[model samples]
Target: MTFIVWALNKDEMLKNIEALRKAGAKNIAVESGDFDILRAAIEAGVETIVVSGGGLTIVFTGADRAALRRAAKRLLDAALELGAVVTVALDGDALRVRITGVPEQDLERLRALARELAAEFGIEVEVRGGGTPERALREIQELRELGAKNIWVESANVDWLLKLLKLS
Candidate 1:
């Protein structure tokens, strides 16, 4: 299964949802966190879900290390829990998860830290968004190096969607 993440406000999400449904996605999950902006996704009648919001926008608030770690873990867990096999992102947030899907035991510490901070601060925890293709690519490369098995890719232009469907 593959997933695509795009930038869609309330108005755009409505229109995009139709295209997604026609493309074979049945169930759609809208992110409850951002209602006015209307964040949503379409589940392709499978466990896979597509997550969409705005394109990658970087906010360099100079976060602390612990906060950054929590953000990364939360995002990773969210993606994994959704059973996302391939996640195509639209310049979304970056994370520091060691993608080496090996030695699952090592993840416990980070997971616990992330959960604790998330409970206390009520925010997505982890290091994310360095604001450039270079930064994004670097993060992606790190994941790949760490043994990330899959990564999703989608074009900024919708024309590529058809190509993806054919490939899928």
Candidate 2:
């Protein structure tokens, strides 16, 4: 399982990245807002850098489809240059996005874009953003069935869930 680490500063970010890496976390999810943290994680040889927040959140916040396309491409290009497989959430209410709602067609478009980017860059793509644990699990199963290589799970209860499921 990929663990998402959020830190208040660069030092803490680096510390957490190191600890997670030592714990055998091959994929680490982090926000795109911090270049230093991202660089540090990639330099530490994390197999996958799960890029979340910022760019993709714009889609649910009144940004046009073209803008979303540009943001995604830019992020994907950066990830490729850094030599890390990236996972992006297609929809989410957190991270200042205020996702009131998104049309099914638009959500599908975003997922399709993710798949295309994954293929073009030869990286993994994640589908995130369902409210409850049950819903999130369902979404994960659906995404996996649909050929998604990765899944993003952002929950306050993730630690307990992971322990309960005995997943690393």
Candidate 3:
């Protein structure tokens, strides 16, 4: 199960945070351009960010974009230092990003950096290859083995996932 935190405005993000908490969401996907929202989430203990195919990605605006890029640099440092795995899934028009490799110890830092990026500039990058259902399942399995309490997914291989989740 997953929860969507609207990035349309600050108020919505604020509203969704408590809603997710109330819904017993241990982890929530939040896409926002507000540092305050991210900070609030980290503090609230709903610390999960994601890139869904339904436009649940980062967005930054104004001069804050540059500043966010800098802040996210910390997370990037963790990724680039250890060689991150960044696989992009493109479905017709929507885009989804899946990044791993950074240790869980750095998740808090990474979460903060992500929020920092959200407060500034949105993404405008490109990729060459794409993702496959096999790969997605492998990653989900990998995350699970790594002790991911709640793994939220969307768009790709819905049937496969539903089946897999039903097994246990």
Candidate 4:
């Protein structure tokens, strides 16, 4: 779930593939440009590619938070190889680590684990994405319940959402 062959584009992707093969490395291969990203990330590290695509954002979507937790943990481990700006968003609140039964503490616990991992690597973590004021309001509130004390949203309803969050 971590370590990737992140490319700058089609050319860079093909380039990475060639290098992988040249090194006798198995070139595994994104949808909406995601598959290859996953492949390169599995066990990463080569001569180090260019900076155009140094930072990769891999989003894992599923109903199982446990699986997502395992997924993010891998990336956190591999990130130290070169350091990718990582943000593990859970079902949207970010970190995607929500507990099911008796999950109240799970959120904070997972948050702590993730932060500890990222801190060691000096890798910064963040949560992004939002929408309409009314919708954004609910999203922010949900994140708050999940223990998201500091949230940011950029939407058409930004003014309203910000106001609702008491930005003023």
Between candidates 2 and 3, the one scoring higher on TM-score is: 2
Q: Which candidate's TM-score is highest?
A: 2
Residues 25-133, candidate 3, lDDT per residue (tens digit)?
8656664323344445445554463323211133333333445455345445654565554333332223333444334444444445556544444543322122334
lDDT score, residue 35, model 1?
A: 20
Give the residue spans of candidate 3 off by over 4 A: 1-125, 156-168
Which regions of candidate 2 fall more than 4 Å away from where they truly are? 52-168
Q: After superposition, which runs of candidate 1 have C-alpha atoms over 4 Å from their true positions?
A: 1-17, 21-70, 73-100, 119-168
Reference-based lDDT, residue 88, model 3? 33
Q: Put down candidate 1 lDDT per residue, 1-168, tens digits, no spaces.
A: 333433333445456656776788654433211222321222212222232211222121235656555555554564455332212222223222322121223334434544565566565543222223333344435444444334444333243344344544
What are the candidates' C-alpha RMSDs? 15.3, 14.3, 13.2, 17.0
Reference-based TM-score, model 1: 0.24
Q: How displaced is residue 104 in candidate 3, in Å?
A: 33
Give the true-structure RMSD of model 2.
14.3
Question: Could you give candidate 4's per-residue lDDT for residues 28-130 as a string of tens digits?
Answer: 3311122233234222423222111112333344325565576577655544343223444454423432111112243344445555655654444542122
lDDT of 3: 0.45
lDDT of 2 by residue, 1-168 (tens): 668775424566678887877888866765333334445555555434332222222222234445545556665564445333344433332112212122344445555655575466444444443333344354445444544444444322344245324532
Candidate 2: global Cα-lDDT? 0.44
Candidate that would win on lDDT: 3
Model 4 alpha-carbon drift over 4 Å, by segment:
1-54, 92-168
lDDT to native, each model: 0.37, 0.44, 0.45, 0.38
